[PDB]
Design a protein around this ligand. Structure first.
Ligand SMILES: Cc1cnc(NC(=O)CCC2CCCC2)s1
Length: 293
C-alpha cells in the first residue's frame, strides 16, 4: 500500500502495536559473540543491546578492538551510517578513536546527558573553548571551536587532533536537544528541520566516512533518524515514490543492528516524518520555511 493511506488505515483501526510486533517477529537474528565476551562487559551500556559480529565497527587496536557500534550500509540509497550507544565513562576515548579511524565528518546526538533524573551518556565533548579534553588511552585531543544554540538544537564545531601524527580535522556536532523524556514529539517539524541541517552540512555525503549517530542505546531515536533519511532519499531517486515501503526499509536496516525503532509510537512517528517530509522533497520549498517559524 502507499504510505499516507496505510497510515490513516492503521490509525482508524488502532493496530500500530500489531504492525510493530510483526516487525519484531520478522527481524533478523545474527550472532553477537564478541559483545558478550567477559572482558567487554564494561563496554556495553545495556546487556540486551549489542552489535552483530558481521557489521560491528572494529577499533584499530590489537589489544581489544571492541566498541558497541554497527555499520548500517544502505545499498540502493547509497548512504551509510554508524549507529552507536552513548559513550560510557570508560569508552569516551574509544568513541573518538572510531570517529578518527572511520573518517567521519559529523556526529549526531539525539539525547540529553541527563534524562528522567539519570545519566544517559557521558559528557564526551568540551563545554568551553579554553578547557580542551585529552584522551590518554587513545592519544587524541579535542577542542571546542564554536557553539550555536538554537531553540530545538545546538551545532558545535570541534577540532580533533591525533597526537601521534599531529594531524587535525574539523568535526561537526549536531545535538537535538528537545526530544521529550517520555513518548515522541507531537509534530515532526522540528525533527525534519534538524535532519535537513545535518544534510546541508555535507556530513552525510559520500566524500566523507559515515556519520556517527547515537542516543542512549543507539537503536530507538537513532533508528528513527536513519530510517526517515533513507526513506526520503529513495523517494527522490525512484521513478515511482509511492513504491517506498517503510516497513521493508526498516527490516533491511535491522539486518545490520538489532532493535531499531523501540516502540509502536516511534514507528508511527517515523511514518509521520516521512509523510510530511515528502512534501518538500517532491517540490514545495516553503514547507521547510513553515517548519522554521
Ligand atoms: C550537557 C547538557 C546540558 N544541557 C543539555 N541539554 C539542554 O540544555 C536542553 C536545552 C533546553 C533549555 C535551553 C533551551 C531548551 S545537555
Amino acid at each position: 500500500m502507499e504510505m499516507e493511506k496505510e497510515f490513516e488505515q492503521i490509525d482508524k483501526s488502532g493496530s500500530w502495536a500489531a504492525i510493530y510486533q510483526d516487525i519484531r517477529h520478522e527481524a533478523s537474528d545474527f550472532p553477537s559473540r564478541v559483545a558478550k565476551l567477559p572482558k567487554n562487559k564494561n563496554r556495553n551500556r545495556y546487556r540486551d543491546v549489542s552489535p552483530f559480529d558481521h557489521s560491528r565497527i572494529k577499533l584499530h587496536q590489537e589489544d581489544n578492538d571492541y566498541i558497541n557500534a554497527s555499520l548500517i550500509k544502505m545499498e540502493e540509497a547509497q548512504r551509510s551510517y554508524i549507529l552507536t550507544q552513548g559513550p560510557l565513562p570508560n569508552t569516551v576515548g574509544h568513541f573518538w578513536e572510531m570517529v578518527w579511524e572511520q573518517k567521519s565528518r559529523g556526529v549526531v546526538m539525539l539525547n540529553r546527558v541527563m534524562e528522567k533524573g539519570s545519566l544517559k551518556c557521558a559528557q564526551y565533548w568540551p563545554q568551553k573553548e579554553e578547557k580542551e579534553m585529552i584522551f590518554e588511552d587513545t592519544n587524541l585531543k579535542l577542542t571546542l571551536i564554536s557553539e550555536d544554540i538554537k531553540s530545538y538544537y545546538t551545532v558545535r564545531q570541534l577540532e580533533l587532533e591525533n597526537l601521534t601524527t599531529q594531524e587535525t580535522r574539523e568535526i561537526l556536532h549536531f545535538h537535538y536537544t528537545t526530544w521529550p523524556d517520555f513518548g515522541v514529539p507531537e509534530s515532526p517539524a522540528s525533527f525534519l528541520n534538524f535532519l535537513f541541517k545535518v544534510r546541508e552540512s555535507g556530513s552525510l555525503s559520500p566524500e566523507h566516512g559515515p556519520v556517527v549517530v547515537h542516543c542512549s542505546a543507539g537503536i530507538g531515536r537513532s533508528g528513527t533518524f536513519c530510517l526517515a533519511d533513507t526513506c526520503l532519499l529513495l523517494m527522490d531517486k525512484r521513478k515511482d515514490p509511492s513504491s517506498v515501503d517503510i516497513k521493508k526499509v526498516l527490516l533491511e536496516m535491522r539486518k545490520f543492528r538489532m532493535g531499531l525503532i523501540q516502540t509502536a509510537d516511534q514507528l508511527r512517528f517515523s511514518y509521520l516524518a516521512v509523510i510530511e517530509g515528502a512534501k518538500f522533497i517532491m517540490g514545495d520549498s516553503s514547507v521547510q520555511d513553515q517548519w522554521k517559524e
